[PDB]
Structures are given as C-alpha cells and as structure tokens.
C-alpha cells in the first residue's frame, strides 16, 4: 500500500553530467544500482516519486517531482531508460524502477517536465550478465533443458528492508533580496524567512512579513527559508540538519528475491 508516502516530499541533487558535458543541479538523480539477480535484472533508485499525486491520492498514470519551493505533477509517459540500446521497463513503485537491457558502459535516465522541457543524468556502469551452463547463447530456445536460477518478484508487499526519513535543512535563495536607493528589501512571499546582515546595527531576526533595512548594500546579507512541514530521505548529497538527527519514520523496499528455473 502507498499509505507510507503521505508525509514525504521529493528533493534536488547534484548530477555529474547534465547532457552537454557539464554538471548541473537536477530534479532527477541516481542512487546506487543493484545487480544481484543471476538473470541479469537491475533495480534503480531515483529521487522522484512515481504513482502519487500532490493530493496524496493513488493514480498509476501520474508522477510528482520537485520544482522551486513546491511539488508539481507530470505525465508518466515520458519516463525512459537506456544503456546504449533502449531498456525495457518492467515495473515501478515510488523511488524504484526495474528494467532489462543489453550490455554497455553507461546508464542514462530522464523524463519530460510539465513545460515541455527534458532532463537527463548519466553515470558510468559496467554491465555483463553471468553465464549459466556450458554453452553461451543469445536468446531463448524452443527445445532445451532447465537449470536453476534466481529472479526478482513483482510484489509490493512489506519486507524486512527499510530506509529512514528525517527533517529537511533550511534552503538559501538569493532572489529574495533586492537593492533600491541604498536600501535592501526582503520579500517573504508567504514563507518564514531568516536573515543575517553584516551592516551597522548587527540586524538579526526571523520574519513573516516584508522588511526594509536602511543604509545597507546587497551581498552584505544572507537569507534562507527555515520552516518545513514534511519529511525527506537523508541522502548523502544533502547536509545534516543538526549534529544529532531525529527520526520521523521509515519506508520499506519492495521486490524480494526468489528461486526460479532457466
């Protein structure tokens, strides 16, 4: 069941190759890739959530992703995976995707945004399925023999592997500040904003309304948004909120292993 996702939110992460040969910060990013099954299937973890709308309802045609300070919906039809030749997607849930695809040295994922803009992220990988038996073959025969092997099960039931969620840290955003006639204005736009200035008077505070600080220049101050109501997975790519973090909940990892024949 999807009930465990009601309080969560997506996040942004760093990507080492954003498609032009340069890095950027992307709404889609890759986590560790697992290759334990002897039949050559993959389990991939991403930062976006598939199958849940922004109103915490179930709809298998939609995905939701993070925009600037707010989630938004997008169509599932744009999801693609390839490793040289295109991959075949066999099932999805939440942060995880299963797919089968041929040999290669890279792995790429991407999707289409709500404004007709594409995003991709690429990581290196080495893919080479194992050999079963005393012969090497390329496809499934009609007349043959059966041997043991293992696979992944298409099941969403609860299992013993779990991951944890925590409170997000504060997020800086320089666009909240503007300079006019020797003064700097702060626009809150309905959010709780904390500010610091190095101008005369040592101004510190936490505000919910617009403020003007007189006799001060831009780039002598700092501002960030501090008040959050949702929980986030503690990815290694984001800073810790406090020296000793507090736990809010946990979710399970689908698709266990099982024994089959080949």
């Amino acid at each position, epitope marked *: 069941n999807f009930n465990v996702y009601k309080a969560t939110r997506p996040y942004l992460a760093h990507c080492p190759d954003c498609g032009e040969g340069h890095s950027c910060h992307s709404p889609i990013a890759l986590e560790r890739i697992r290759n334990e099954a002897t039949d050559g299937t993959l389990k991939i973890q991403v930062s976006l959530q598939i199958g849940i709308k922004t109103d915490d309802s179930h709809d298998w045609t939609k995905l939701r992703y993070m925009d600037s300070h707010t989630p938004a919906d997008a169509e599932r039809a744009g999801l693609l995976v390839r490793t040289s030749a295109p991959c075949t997607i066999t099932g999805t849930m939440g942060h995880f995707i299963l797919a089968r695809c041929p040999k290669g040295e890279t792995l790429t994922v991407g999707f289409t945004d709500s404004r007709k803009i594409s995003h991709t992220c690429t990581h290196p990988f080495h893919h080479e399925p194992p050999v079963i038996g005393r012969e090497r073959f390329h496809s499934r025969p009609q007349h043959g023999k059966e041997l043991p092997c293992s696979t992944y099960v298409q099941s969403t039931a609860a299992t013993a592997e779990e991951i944890e969620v925590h409170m997000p840290p504060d997020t800086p955003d320089r666009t909240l500040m503007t300079q006019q006639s020797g*003064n700097v204005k702060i*626009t809150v*736009n*309905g959010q709780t904003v904390r500010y610091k200035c190095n101008c005369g008077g040592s101004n510190e505070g936490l505000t919910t*309304t*617009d403020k003007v600080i007189n006799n001060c220049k831009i780039d002598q101050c700092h501002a960030a948004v501090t008040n959050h109501k949702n929980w986030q997975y503690n990815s290694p790519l984001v800073p810790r909120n406090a020296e000793l973090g507090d736990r809010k909940g946990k979710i399970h990892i689908p698709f266990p292993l099982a024994n089959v024949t080949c």
Partner: antibody
Amino acid sequence: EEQLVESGGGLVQPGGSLRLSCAASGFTFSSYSMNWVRQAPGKGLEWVSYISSSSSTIHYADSVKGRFTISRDNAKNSLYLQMNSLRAEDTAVYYCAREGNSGYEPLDYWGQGTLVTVS
Amino acid sequence: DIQMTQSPSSLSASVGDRVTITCRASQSISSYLNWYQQKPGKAPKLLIYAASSLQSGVPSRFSGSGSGTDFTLTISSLQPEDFATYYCQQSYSTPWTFGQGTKVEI
C-alpha cells in the same frame, strides 16, 4: 498632494453585506502596502487587516476571520474592504491607511473613515 | 501577542508646564515603536516614527527615546494647541497593537 478618501458607509440590516472603498491620489499606488483599522465611540485603536504591495501576503485579525476579505487593484488605484454576514455588534467607523516605504515600519498617512451601522 | 500599557492615564497641567508620557510592553520591541497624537473629532494622528528620530513637520518641542520595553516621550513646552490624546504602537510582530491612550487637560 496625498489623499485618502473613504466612502461606502451607511446602515445595513443584520445578515446583509457592505463594501467599503478607499481612494488614493498623490503617490504611486503599487509601491506601498496598506492596512485597515477600526475605531468607534468609547473604543481605542484596533488593527483589522493587512495586504502586501503585490497581493502575495495577507493577514486577518482573529476576531474578523471569515466575514472579512481584502483586495486591491494596482491599475485602478483603488483599495477595497468587503464585510459579509454583518452582525449587530459591528457598528464603527472604518479607516484606510498607508504604510511607509522605509525602515522601522512607519505609518505616514491616515484617511477619514465612514460610519457603518448594522441594525 | 505583545501587550502594551502606558502611564499616566491622564495628565493635568497648566500652560508652560512640561509633559512626560511613558509606554511599557510585555515583550521586547527592539525600538520598533512610534507615537501618535490627535485631537477629538479627527482621524489623522502622527508623532515621531522612531526612537530618537524627529518626524518631518513636527515642532522641535517634541522629542523622545526608546529602550527595552520602556519608551518615553516628552514635550518641552505645553501650549493650548498641544492638548490632545496620545498613543503608542509597536510594529515588531503580527498583529500590530496599540496602547490604551493618554489624555492631557489644562
């Protein structure tokens, strides 16, 4: 010169509605925030509502929630305050005021309000 | 949230006497306090917008200063035109609040 002109008062029966308008001259309307305040004989000063210059931030007093809504039009140079579900106790003079574009949250100008009676 | 009180509730003084009015708060205001003055029958009201600051158009007889929850305003000369009602306002948080009012009579 700066002016604030209040109009739209009168007597309304209980359960009705009344719209107040505040007109402005002498300054750039879109550059300043505005507030509404209330006063009545035997009573002191009270803040009612606030609207930011871009209509992005709105606050209401706890005693006036639901019955009151505030809006503005930066192209028509007009400020509105609308009261719905009027109750007999809501008899007072309502005023509009300007908020200054400087530090330490000054109020530089006040209007001259109109009497609203519910009875 | 932030409660304010001022004292005395009224003053009784003759022309030529000085006027002192103080305002107190239950919470820190960090100098975000202003003063108002008006006569009966009028909506407009205005005094100094900040501690140790003089508002444009205000005669030099009006002065005051501020401190932690303790604000003071004085008048150096009391003339027949100076008899009015005074208020304090704090603008540190939301909602904005006012004092109860002080009157000066001859």
